């Protein structure tokens, strides 16, 4: 009914449409994950909705929505409809890095968000897949 994973935000990278083309998306996502894996930006971002880089978060799946939730406060920081997630993936290399791509509602920018997960990052991909499929099923 609800799926809830402890994760840390690693930030985002801006993507182009050309990068999200079939045949190109899995290289693009692996690159973003590799790029952010050992990166750090210590700048506090006033405009990051409290779910930006380096934040401990609950990544939750409920009601066809991916939710980012403040763990101490339980505040809903971010709600992403699963239906408009363009792309998602899991770190390929030497795993617990999860990524998804969606358009930012306010800026119209395509962004790849990466999270370091406490669980196998494939548990998140697999849960999202079950929900995507149920949504496709109703076609
Ligand atoms: Hg959790
Ligand atoms: Hg990417
Ligand atoms: Hg889907």
From Swiss-Prot:
Tissues showing expression: Highly expressed in brain; strongly reduced in post-mortem elderly subjects with Alzheimer disease.
PTM per Swiss-Prot/TrEMBL: Phosphorylated following nuclear translocation. Phosphorylated at Ser-94 by PKC upon insulin activation.
Annotated effect of mutating residue 94 to E: Increased activation of the RAC1-ARF6 axis
Residue list for modification Phosphoserine: 94
Highest taxon, organism lineage: Eukaryota
Compartment(s) of residence: Cell membrane; Cytoplasm; Nucleus; Cell projection, Growth cone
Domain PID: 5-138
Summary of the function given for this chain in its UniProt record: Transcription coregulator that can have both coactivator and corepressor functions. Adapter protein that forms a transcriptionally active complex with the gamma-secretase-derived amyloid precursor protein (APP) intracellular domain. Plays a central role in the response to DNA damage by translocating to the nucleus and inducing apoptosis. May act by specifically recognizing and binding histone H2AX phosphorylated on 'Tyr-142' (H2AXY142ph) at double-strand breaks (DSBs), recruiting other pro-apoptosis factors such as MAPK8/JNK1.
Quaternary data: Component of a complex, at least composed of APBB1, RASD1/DEXRAS1 and APP. Interacts (via PID domain 2) with APP (with the intracellular domain of the amyloid-beta precursor protein). Interacts (via PID domain 2) with RASD1/DEXRAS1; impairs the transcription activation activity. Interacts (via PID domain 1) with KAT5/TIP60. Interacts (via the WW domain) with the proline-rich region of APBB1IP. Interacts with TSHZ1 and TSHZ2. Interacts (via the WW domain) with histone H2AX (when phosphorylated on 'Tyr-142') and the proline-rich region of ENAH. Interacts with MAPK8.
Protein name (database record): Amyloid beta precursor protein binding family B member 1
Organism: Homo sapiens (Human)
Lineage summary: Eukaryota, Metazoa, Chordata, Craniata, Vertebrata
Gene, per the UniProt record: APBB1
Portion of the full sequence shown: 366 to 505 of 710
């Amino acid at each position: 009914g609800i799926k809830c994973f402890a994760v840390r935000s690693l930030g985002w990278v801006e993507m182009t449409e050309e990068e999200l083309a079939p045949g190109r998306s899995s290289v693009a996502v692996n690159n973003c994950i590799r790029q952010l894996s050992y990166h750090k930006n210590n700048l506090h971002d006033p405009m990051s909705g409290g779910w930006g880089e380096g934040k401990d978060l609950l990544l939750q799946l409920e009601d066809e929505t991916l939710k980012l939730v403040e763990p101490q406060s339980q505040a809903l920081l971010h709600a992403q409809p699963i239906i408009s997630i363009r792309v998602w993936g899991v770190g390929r290399d030497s795993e617990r890095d999860f990524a998804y791509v969606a358009r930012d509602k306010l800026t119209q920018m395509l962004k790849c968000h990466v999270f370091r997960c406490e669980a196998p990052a494939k548990n998140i991909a697999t849960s999202l897949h079950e929900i995507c499929s149920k949504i496709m099923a109703e076609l």
